[PDB]
From Swiss-Prot, chain B:
Organism expressing this protein natively: Oryctolagus cuniculus (Rabbit)
Comment field on protein domains: The N-terminal beta-like import receptor binding (BIB) domain mediates interaction with IPO5, IPO7, KPNB1 and TNPO1.
Assembly and binders: Component of the large ribosomal subunit. Interacts with LYAR and GNL2. Interacts with MDM2; this interaction may promote MDM2-mediated p53/TP53 polyubiquitination. Directly interacts (via BIB domain) with IPO5, IPO7, KPNB1 and TNPO1; these interactions are involved in RPL23A nuclear import for the assembly of ribosomal subunits. Interacts with IPO8.
Gene this protein is translated from: RPL23A
Cellular component terms (Gene Ontology): cytosolic ribosome; nucleus; ribosomal subunit
Name of the molecule in the record: Large ribosomal subunit protein uL23
Residue numbers of the full-length protein present here: 38 to 156 of 156
Compartments in which it is found: Cytoplasm; Nucleus
UniProtKB/Swiss-Prot annotation, chain C:
Signal peptide: none
N6-acetyllysine: residues carrying this PTM: K9, K72, K192
Similarity comment text for this entry: Belongs to the eukaryotic ribosomal protein eL8 family.
Subcellular location: Cytoplasm
Broad class of the protein's primary localization: cytoplasm
Primary role: Component of the large ribosomal subunit. The ribosome is a large ribonucleoprotein complex responsible for the synthesis of proteins in the cell.
Name of the gene encoding the protein in the UniProt record: RPL7A
Keyword Repeat: no
Subunit structure: Component of the large ribosomal subunit. Interacts with CRY1. Interacts with DICER1, AGO2, TARBP2, MOV10 and EIF6; they form a large RNA-induced silencing complex (RISC).
Record protein name field: Large ribosomal subunit protein eL8
GO molecular function: RNA binding
Biological source species: Oryctolagus cuniculus
Swiss-Prot record, chain D:
Range covered out of full length: 2 to 68 of 204
Molecular function terms from GO: RNA binding; structural constituent of ribosome
Record's keyword annotation contains Heme: no
Oligomer status and interactors: Component of the large ribosomal subunit. Interacts with IFIT1 (via TPR repeats 1-4).
One of the GO biological process terms: cytoplasmic translation
Gene that specifies this protein: RPL15
Designated name of the protein: Large ribosomal subunit protein eL15
Key word Endoplasmic reticulum present: no
Domain of life of the organism encoding this protein: Eukaryota
An annotated GO cellular component: cytosolic large ribosomal subunit
Function description: Component of the large ribosomal subunit. The ribosome is a large ribonucleoprotein complex responsible for the synthesis of proteins in the cell.
Species in which this protein is naturally found: Oryctolagus cuniculus
UniProt record similarity statement: Belongs to the eukaryotic ribosomal protein eL15 family.
RNA sequence: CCGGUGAGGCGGGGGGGCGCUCGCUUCUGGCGCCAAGCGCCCGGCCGCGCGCCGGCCGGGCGCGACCCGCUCCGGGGACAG
């Protein structure tokens, strides 16, 4: 929960495909998003919430 | 053929030489103004100091404000040919530094106090 | 056997979502310091912009085979350097009254270095061959000079590198070099060199004046416009013909 | 000498050669800092006329000012 | 002039092939780096001895991880300013 913002945020952890490290981003959570869920991003990503 | 592994260009480390002056900035080094005689001003002969010397087996001196406890210990050792257990210092509400010099059990504070002249 | 069965292969799939990418060459994607980017972008601009023929003339430089012969001739007439002027002066001083030394003897022919000196002896029709560097940092130093050489009938050539031209003299750089006079041994070689030089610069100066140079787009834009032109041709390339 | 030719060239600023050179120089200078040391005089003839001499101890600086 | 980045794979070419297509990853709150393999060389020790032969120890280079390029990628643009 972000103070001053009604919409909740979601922390998503990726892996950088250049260095051995785990990147973390703070997206805006959409309806139906739950913890322990795989979310994809890219041109070939499927059409899911 | 040296490949740029990273996309960042940082400043290379160049050789830096150590200073080798042609002449010294000043002709001679400054003589120390905190010698073993300047640090110790005079022993304290107050009634409280007298009782401290007689009972706690310590010595009370008036010391320069710039002196450290190691300097006080070494100065007392060099001056009075004594070995010090510990030194407790304080700043009096007049600008002078007061130090309690605890003497080792081998030596007696009363004897050295008689030798230096205070009693 | 010489092969241990424990020796496996373990290949790496360098794809998307697989193990991390290898440390490839990234010279194209380096955030270079501002001066490197500036010195590359000024060359890019010189390629893009319509360079006037006065500056574009120095892009036409003498070829390697003629340049090496020119340097071979120039090395013979190098000016006196340090440690040699003093030796000559001492030789003349010790011979002041030793062998009846009047010292009128001779000054051997030498090269000419400065722009001022070369221009002065070109306006007087004293020079026979003039060599001009192409990479002077202010181009304004040598713009008029090819036109002046053509007007005065003095053959001129453009040589690669001001440092290379200035290595003939004993300094870092030199703008131009002029052959005021050469020894009788090398007069035929000089004549051949000036004959080869003046058939590329002096007699074609009108073309050089009319020859603008530039307006060359980058390979990305050129490739894009070529793709568009090929598509436009394909619109009517097999349907009609 | 070449200095007379350089001065006469610099008097014809409206010409294509001079305007091209001035535009390139202006872009290069605009890509630099507002005050930095220039190693050599861009206009040797003008510097000589103003009193500059090619000797050690003579320094020039390029300064950018808002119009 | 604006945005992103640790300015990390931009544009062309034929290499690669399951079939234009991609740098090959979508049933799950796992792991993933600092190369394996191949090939060409160098130095020291030892035996054959004709030694770029073999055994041990320690290293170098290339493919693996395609080639060439001129703006880092994009978005505006003779206009915003």
């Amino acid at each position: 929960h972000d103070p001053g913002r009604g919409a909740p945020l979601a922390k998503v952890v990726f892996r950088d495909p250049y260095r051995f490290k785990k990147r973390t981003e703070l997206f805006i959570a959409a309806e139906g998003i739950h913890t322990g869920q795989f979310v994809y991003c890219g041109k070939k990503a499927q059409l899911n919430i | 053929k040296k490949i740029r592994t990273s996309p960042t260009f940082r400043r290379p480390k160049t050789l830096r030489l150590r200073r080798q002056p042609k002449y010294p900035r000043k002709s001679a080094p400054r003589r120390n103004k905190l010698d073993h005689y300047a640090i110790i001003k005079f022993p304290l002969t107050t009634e409280s100091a007298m009782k401290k010397i007689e009972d706690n087996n310590t010595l009370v001196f008036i010391v320069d404000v710039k002196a450290n406890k190691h300097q006080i210990k070494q100065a007392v050792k060099k001056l009075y040919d004594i070995d010090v257990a510990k030194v407790n210092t304080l700043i009096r509400p007049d600008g002078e530094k007061k130090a309690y010099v605890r003497l080792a059990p081998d030596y007696d504070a009363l004897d050295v106090a008689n030798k230096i002249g205070i009693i | 056997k010489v092969v241990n069965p424990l020796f496996e292969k373990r290949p790496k799939n360098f794809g998307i979502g697989q193990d991390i990418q290898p440390k490839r060459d990234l010279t194209r994607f380096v955030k270079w310091p501002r001066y490197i980017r500036l010195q590359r972008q000024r060359a890019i601009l010189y390629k893009r912009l319509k360079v006037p023929p006065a500056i574009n003339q120095f892009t036409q430089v003498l070829d390697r085979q003629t340049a090496t012969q020119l340097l071979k001739l120039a090395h013979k007439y190098r000016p006196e350097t340090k440690q040699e002027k003093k030796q000559r002066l001492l030789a003349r001083a010790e011979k002041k009254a030793a062998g009846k030394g009047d010292v009128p003897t001779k000054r051997p022919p030498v090269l000419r270095a400065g722009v001022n000196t070369v221009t002065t002896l070109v306006e007087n029709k004293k020079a026979q061959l003039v060599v001009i560097a192409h990479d002077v940092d202010p181009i304004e130093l040598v713009v008029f000079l090819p036109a002046l050489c053509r007007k005065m009938g003095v053959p001129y050539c453009i040589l690669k590198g001001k440092a290379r031209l200035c290595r003939l003299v004993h300094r870092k750089t030199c703008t131009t070099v002029a052959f005021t006079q050469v020894n009788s041994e090398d007069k035929g070689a000089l004549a051949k060199l000036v004959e080869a030089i003046r058939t590329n610069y002096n007699d074609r100066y009108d073309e050089i004046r009319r020859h603008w140079g530039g307006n060359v787009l980058g390979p990305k834009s050129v490739a894009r416009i070529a793709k568009l032109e090929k598509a436009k041709a394909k619109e009517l390339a097999t349907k009609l013909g | 000498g070449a200095y007379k030719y350089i001065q006469e060239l610099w008097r014809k600023k409206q010409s294509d050669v001079m305007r091209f050179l001035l535009r390139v120089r202006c872009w290069q200078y605009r890509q630099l800092s507002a005050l930095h040391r220039a190693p050599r005089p861009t206009r040797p003839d003008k510097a000589r006329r103003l009193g500059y001499k090619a000797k050690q101890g003579y320094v020039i600086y390029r300064i950018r000012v808002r119009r």
